[PDB]
């Protein structure tokens, strides 16, 4: 019962660790150690695969360091391969990369830790910035799955991972209301966005930003300042520790699988035997049920991808660009090592979002006798009108229509309106004590939900398209609210009834 | 200066495509194409790579055509990695090259032909639009991203002017457990006449088995089969229900020559697509190693003048996944004889099939009518959706042609409105039958001439058994 197992490591003392781990797992059941090396040569990588896996019973490989041809030549025959030192989420793609093992999850798993960060103060107000990477896209689908089950989260902000001049997003962020924001990008894009939003003062008080892990580097603090808490999985990852954990759990696995039924032998090096691969998925599917309560780094639990569940994290304070542990997520519970969080404005507390809104964008349409639009005088002052009792009717300066012709170079005409609505909203501004923003539609549309002639879109137009796109806080119009209006919006109760 | 080393893996013949037209037709003859035909019988990958740059030891190719007579989508990703590392444009032909997984490889310069699963989705809804049948049930397993496909098809049925309502929950990953409890719990709520399909095939055999042990297979449902469930052509399982229908590419028109002739007629003249810039032709290399060692200077979209080409009127435009935007698709019924019997085709938003009469196998009845306002009023189908998309029945306005030949499908796409439309609706509601409703095109009610037949009365008394 002699079992051979491959390995790809960059250090010969780690090959000595591999041989010693072979001797340690030999305490049960016999093991066989084979050649361990490392190549920056993809041709020589796959060539060494099917010139050195010409042994019949090489059952597993532990590789080390980017993608690689051995993800393809060994991803067919089809043995489990333990990736150790690369963190691509492309290996999580179980379409092609189904037959691989990784100890640590790749960067996608930080979204659950950020949901735990939400649960730390049980807060809601958050905006995310997401780069245009399909790995980051898949992590975005993962966090959307994490949200579907509360959380306020305002919107996702899209980023291009090769662009600069993010100020077009930064002014939008100035218009935004949630003060808490986490970045999801690499550190080189973080150079641009940290220096730009610090230039554009989107630190708030120094509190606004938060950090993940992949943008943490040496230059990362030559950017975004102190107080802005980052994270890391496991500090000082001993590769020998992961070696010992993997060898212990695979010793458990080989004493499981070697007491089983008929097992096909793996082939012998890319020649003649391109017909036998089912044994790999066979003992891999049985091996995925194995678990690991032991471990020098602790107990190891497998997800669907075989990554270690119930991991730890170093929640980091930034005392003058330091990484001071204020807590650890102990598998299921965040266990705090609580120190003072600075947040350089001084947000040492649980501020729990924000308190912003007193400005109300009001996009309207003229309608007799509800709205009586009337242009102002030459100075923008309204032509003052009285009632039948001589009392001055209220006319707030109506702006917004940049078109009367539309088709000609019109201006945003300064008018002012009067009706039920104007005195009504002025009473409501006395009532709720907000401030007031007049807007109108230059084309003058309610705007119906027409089907767009492209692929499967039925989109509101006009005021409904604007409030759909968030271009209005308030729409005041004669509105017979249908089901399609009501299924998207909030609205207070109607008050007038007609036919 | 165009080297295309012809690669054959399997049992096919070399005289299927001689050069024999590449020298002759019209080739703007300053481009000098060169070929290298070879035929293999093994799929050994180290032999493949040593074949690659023992072939590319003869430097003057840099891009081949290749036919591997296997299933092998793993090698269809491996050659994407090969065009990603030893970067060159290639084109796939047959077998493992037709079976395309189409994952994201930004540095593979290699595209193929083929239909997308969204293109298959569009035709699989277009046939349901054509026969006015409504989707109520897809079955889905876990095999990757089916969920995005059903998101797209779900937005489509949201925005196809009719809410063709889905069943409740369709993912049943029963490969993890026994699953039979939730199999019966899901199959209890089924209210469809039709079942659309996931990707897997061994689970298709197993789910044929669980539909047999539930009682689903007989004639209350029919199945549309995309590729990767059909897989190989000449294999049918034993738990296979009667009357499946496959959709794939037209392999009876594609297991052939004169399509790699189209491929080389794209590769040459794509040489002059690049030479329309007068781009200097990149030097072919004795290679596998120095070509990714110099630089990756060649990685700037040479194929952008290649995915927008039209040869002999055929728009050969390659979609960005590695498929073609305009494939040729076939409709083939899997019969009770386990036989692959072609229903028809799809080409350019038209379902080029044999019969409007879809074949089947006492609910079915036989019915004829003649137009009479206001019993029967006018017939014009609204082309907003292409079918009569309001509240009235196709009366089967019969086709007519020149009398030198038959040319009788028997139907022009025209509905009918009136009293007897509602009468037929109420009587199909009360009695729950089906009908073969026609239109009298052979005269009026009719005057019986010499005792012989006349009209509507004639079309019934002609023993067509139609009910007037």
């Amino acid at each position: 019962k002699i079992v051979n197992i491959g390995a790809v490591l960059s250090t010969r003392k780690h090959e000595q660790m591999f041989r010693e781990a072979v001797n340690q797992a030999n305490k049960r059941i016999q093991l066989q150690a084979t050649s361990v090396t490392h190549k920056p040569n993809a041709i020589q990588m796959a060539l060494s695969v099917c010139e050195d896996l010409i042994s019949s019973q090489v059952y597993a490989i532990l590789v080390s360091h980017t993608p690689t041809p051995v993800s393809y030549t060994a991803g067919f025959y089809r043995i489990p391969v333990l990736g150790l030192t690369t963190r691509m989420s492309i290996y999580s793609d179980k379409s092609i990369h189904l037959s691989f093992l990784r100890t640590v999850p790749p960067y996608s798993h930080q979204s659950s830790v950020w949901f735990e960060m939400m649960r730390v103060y049980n807060w809601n107000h958050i905006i995310l910035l997401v780069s245009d990477d399909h790995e980051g896209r898949a992590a975005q689908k993962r966090l959307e799955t994490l949200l579907e089950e509360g959380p306020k989260a305002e919107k996702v902000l899209q980023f291009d991972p090769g662009t600069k001049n993010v100020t077009a997003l930064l002014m939008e962020a100035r218009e935004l209301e949630a003060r808490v924001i986490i970045l999801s990008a690499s550190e080189d894009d973080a150079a641009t966005v940290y220096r730009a939003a610090a230039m554009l003062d989107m630190t708030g008080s120094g509190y606004v930003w938060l950090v993940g892990e992949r943008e943490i580097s040496g230059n990362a603090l030559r950017y975004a300042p102190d107080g802005i808490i980052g994270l890391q999985l496991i500090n000082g990852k001993n590769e020998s520790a992961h070696i010992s954990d993997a060898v212990g759990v695979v010793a458990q696995a080989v004493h499981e699988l070697l007491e089983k039924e008929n097992i096909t032998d793996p082939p012998r090096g890319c020649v003649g035997n391109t017909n036998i691969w089912k044994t790999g998925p066979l003992f891999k599917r049985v091996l995925m049920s194995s678990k690991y309560a032991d471990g020098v780094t602790g107990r190891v639990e497998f997800n669907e991808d075989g990554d270690r569940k119930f991991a730890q994290y170093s929640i980091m304070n930034l005392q003058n660009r330091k990484l001071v542990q204020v807590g650890i997520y102990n598998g299921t519970h965040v266990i705090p090592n609580d120190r003072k969080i600075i947040w350089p404005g001084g947000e040492t507390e649980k501020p729990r979002g924000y308190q912003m809104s007193t400005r109300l964008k009001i996009v309207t349409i003229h309608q007799e006798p509800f709205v009586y639009v009337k242009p102002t005088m030459s100075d923008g002052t309204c032509k003052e009108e009285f009632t039948v009792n001589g009392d001055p009717v209220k006319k707030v300066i109506c702006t917004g229509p940049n078109d009367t012709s539309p088709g000609s170079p019109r201006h945003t005409v300064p008018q002012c309106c009067y009706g039920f609505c104007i005195d009504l909203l002025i009473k409501l501004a006395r009532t709720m004590q907000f401030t007031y923003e007049v807007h109108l539609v230059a084309d003058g549309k309610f705007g119906t939900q027409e089907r767009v002639q492209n692929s499967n879109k039925k989109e509101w137009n006009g005021m409904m398209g604007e409030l759909l796109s968030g271009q209005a806080d308030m729409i005041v119009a004669p509105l017979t609210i249908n089901n399609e209006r009501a299924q998207y919006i909030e609205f207070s109760k109607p008050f007038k009834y007609q036919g | 200066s165009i080297g295309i080393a012809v690669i054959l893996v399997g049992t096919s013949d070399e005289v299927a495509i001689k050069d024999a037209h590449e020298k002759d037709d019209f080739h703007h003859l300053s481009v000098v194409p060169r070929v290298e035909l070879v035929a293999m019988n093994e799929t050994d990958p180290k032999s493949i790579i040593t074949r690659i740059c023992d072939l590319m030891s003869d430097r003057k190719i840099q891009g081949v055509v290749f036919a591997d007579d296997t299933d092998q989508e793993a090698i269809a990703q491996i050659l994407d990695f090969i065009s990603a590392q030893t970067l060159t444009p290639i084109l796939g032909i047959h077998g493992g090259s037709s079976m395309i997984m189409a994952d994201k490889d930004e540095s593979s310069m290699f595209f193929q032909f083929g239909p997308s699963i969204e293109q298959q989705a569009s035709v699989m809804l277009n046939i349901m639009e054509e026969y006015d049948w409504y989707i109520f049930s897809i079955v889905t397993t876990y095999f990757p991203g089916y969920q995005d496909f059903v998101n797209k098809i779900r937005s489509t049925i949201e925005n196809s002017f009719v809410g063709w309502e889905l069943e409740e929950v369709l993912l049943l990953d029963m490969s993890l457990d026994d699953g039979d409890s939730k199999i019966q719990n899901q199959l209890k709520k089924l209210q469809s006449p039709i079942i659309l399909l996931y990707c897997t095939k061994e689970e298709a055999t197993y789910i044929f088995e669980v539909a047999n042990s539930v009682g689903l297979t007989g004639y209350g449902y029919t199945w549309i089969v995309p590729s990767l469930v059909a897989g190989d052509t000449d294999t049918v399982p034993s738990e296979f229900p009667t009357g499946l229908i496959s959709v794939s590419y037209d392999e009876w028109d594609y297991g052939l020559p004169a399509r790699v002739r189209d491929g080389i007629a794209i590769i040459t003249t794509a040489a002059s697509d690049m030479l329309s810039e007068h781009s200097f032709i990149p030097e072919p290399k004795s290679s596998c190693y120095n070509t990714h060692e110099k630089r990756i200077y060649q990685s700037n979209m040479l194929n952008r003048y290649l995915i927008n080409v039209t040869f002999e009127g055929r728009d050969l435009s390659f979609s960005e996944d590695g498929y073609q935007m305009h494939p040729k698709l076939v409709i083939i019924l899997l019969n009770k004889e386990r036989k692959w019997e072609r229903v028809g085709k799809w080409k350019d938003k038209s379902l080029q099939m044999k019969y409007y009469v879809w074949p089947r196998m006492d609910d079915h009845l036989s019915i004829v009518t003649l137009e009479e306002a206001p019993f029967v009023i006018v017939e014009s189908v609204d082309p907003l959706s292409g079918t009569c998309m309001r509240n009235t029945v196709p009366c089967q306005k019969r086709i007519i042609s020149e009398n030198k030949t038959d040319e009788e499908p028997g139907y022009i796409k025209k509905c009918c409105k009136g009293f007897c439309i509602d009468i037929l609706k109420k009587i199909s509601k009360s009695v729950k039958f089906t009908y073969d409703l026609y239109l009298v095109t052979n005269g009026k009610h009719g005057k019986k001439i010499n005792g012989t037949w006349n009209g509507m009365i004639g079309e019934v008394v002609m023993k067509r058994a139609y009910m007037a």
Epitope: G162, T163, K164 | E106, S276, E277, H278, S279, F280, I281, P282, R295, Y297, Q298, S299, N300, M301, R304
Partner: antibody, heavy 116, light 112 residues
Framework: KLQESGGGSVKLGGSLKLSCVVS????????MSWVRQTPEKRLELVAV????????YYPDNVKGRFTISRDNAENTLYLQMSSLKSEDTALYYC????????????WGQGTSVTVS | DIQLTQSPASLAVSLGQRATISCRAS??????????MHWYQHKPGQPPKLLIK???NLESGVPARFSGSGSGTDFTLNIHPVEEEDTATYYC?????????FGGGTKLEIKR
């Protein structure tokens, strides 16, 4: 690197041959161009040759008029001109391949050709 | 080749400012993989050195003040400090098929 020669004050449609002085690299592996720089400061590409003369291209006011000679043993580029116009008075600062390099790469100091 | 326009064709700016030179093509030029801009600056008597390689891909040997961007038809060059060595005429060539097509071009001087 690059230096032009053979250009000067010339006349109408007889002959003129430019000569690109070449030093400091491998000339036989790069792509060539022709580099009319007008006194109105609006550049025109006259012609292009490859590393072995197997790929030339002329625009409409170039074909029939001007031809390229290209030596790799000498490493010297040439532009044989014929049927010149007074609009063809321009400067020349040649440049080489930008490694698939639609644009050119490798400017040196050059010459001026004045057709008068 | 896709035709360009270039604006402003002459510009005098003061020192330290963020000088922006717009370029407007006629059509969309390239893909997400790369772009077409090859920017060139020099003076009369100077040869034009490459500044930008695709649209923001910077040629080596270029000081960090110069920074170009843009896509489709919109294209720009931003020089966020203006210094005394920046007086040069600026040109950008490209090829959808023809490697020399310009806009109107521009010459950058210094406002004093």
């Amino acid at each position: 690197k690059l230096q032009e020669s053979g250009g000067g004050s010339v006349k109408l449609g007889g002959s003129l041959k430019l000569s690109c002085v070449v030093s400091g690299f491998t000339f036989s592996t790069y792509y060539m161009s022709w580099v009319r720089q007008t006194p109105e400061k609006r550049l025109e590409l006259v012609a292009v040759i490859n590393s072995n003369g197997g790929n030339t291209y002329y625009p409409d006011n170039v074909k029939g008029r001007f031809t390229i000679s290209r030596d790799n043993a000498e490493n010297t580029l040439y532009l044989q001109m014929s049927s010149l116009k007074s609009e063809d008075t321009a400067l020349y600062y040649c440049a080489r391949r930008d490694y698939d390099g639609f644009a050119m790469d490798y400017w040196g100091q050059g010459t001026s050709v004045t057709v008068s | 080749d896709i035709q360009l326009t270039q604006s402003p064709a002459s510009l005098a700016v003061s020192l330290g400012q963020r000088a922006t030179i717009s370029c407007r093509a006629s059509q969309s030029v390239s893909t997400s993989r790369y772009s077409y801009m090859h920017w060139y600056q020099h003076k009369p008597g100077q040869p034009p050195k490459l500044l930008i390689k695709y649209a923001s891909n910077l040629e080596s040997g270029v000081p960090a003040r110069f920074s170009g961007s843009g896509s489709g038809t919109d294209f720009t060059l931003n020089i966020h400090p203006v210094e005394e060595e920046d007086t040069a005429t600026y040109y950008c060539q490209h090829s959808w098929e023809n490697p020399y097509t310009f806009g109107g071009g521009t010459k950058l001087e210094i406002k004093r």
